Amino acid sequence: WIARTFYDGPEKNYEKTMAILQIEAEKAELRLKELEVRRLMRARGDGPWYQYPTIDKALIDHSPKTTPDN
Amino acid sequence: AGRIASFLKNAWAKEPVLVASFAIGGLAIILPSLSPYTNYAIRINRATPYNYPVPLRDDGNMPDVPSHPQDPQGPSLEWLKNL
């Protein structure tokens, strides 16, 4: 009666633990991958992150400058 | 409107310098926007050649760019001489 009224079968806890383990293992893998990706982008600078600004090329004046040799 | 007239008459007495200075300053602020010659001044500033006019490379599709200074094409400064 106690088991019927208050508790649940072993399979429920078993499968819930499987799901929790899957979720947290995926999270750990994603954390390692994030660290590696951050290191690579900061070292190289070829990704969307760590893009430090440079001078805009639309600021340059392309017109004769009173002197042929600029 | 009477209070304004009384105030101006009171200020023209015993304070003519301030009245004159404020009038001159207000006129200096207002008048340039109404004068028709400010555009003429801007044009005269445009017409003054400080730099060499660099010729364009003729490609057969510039009927409006002259080939010689004597050619009729290009802007004229006859309005400046008439001024």
Ligand SMILES: CCCCCCCCCCCCCCCCC[C@@H](O)O[C@H](CO[C@H](O)CCCCCCCCCCCCCCC)COP(=O)(O)OCC[N+](C)(C)C
């Ligand atoms: C002769 C009898 C011998 C045995 C006596 C046993 C008496 C039991 C009293 C102590 C029980 C402690 C509580 C244990 C469980 C409570 C918490 C939780 O586990 O139970 C909840 C349920 O709790 C109960 O609904 C309520 C328990 C409250 C007990 C209160 C008893 C004392 C009350 C005293 C009041 C006095 C009167 C007022 C005087 C002013 C959730 O259960 P639920 O998730 O649904 O279960 C679903 C199971 N399925 C999935 C298989 C269907």
Ligand SMILES: CCCCCCCC/C=C\CCCCCCCC(=O)O[C@H](COC(=O)CCCCCCC/C=C/CCCCCCCC)COP(=O)(O)OCCN
């Ligand atoms: C948007 C235009 C602005 C540019 C114009 C002004 C350029 C420069 C002028 C401004 C300089 C600073 C002005 C400082 C004002 C101080 C006022 C003040 O408190 O002095 C009062 C005196 O002045 C006043 O009472 C307050 C203002 C009085 C009149 C000010 C001008 C009012 C409007 C004038 C122009 C009106 C429109 C022109 C119409 C003219 C008719 C054709 C006290 O006099 P004291 O010298 O201290 O005491 C000695 C005597 N025992």
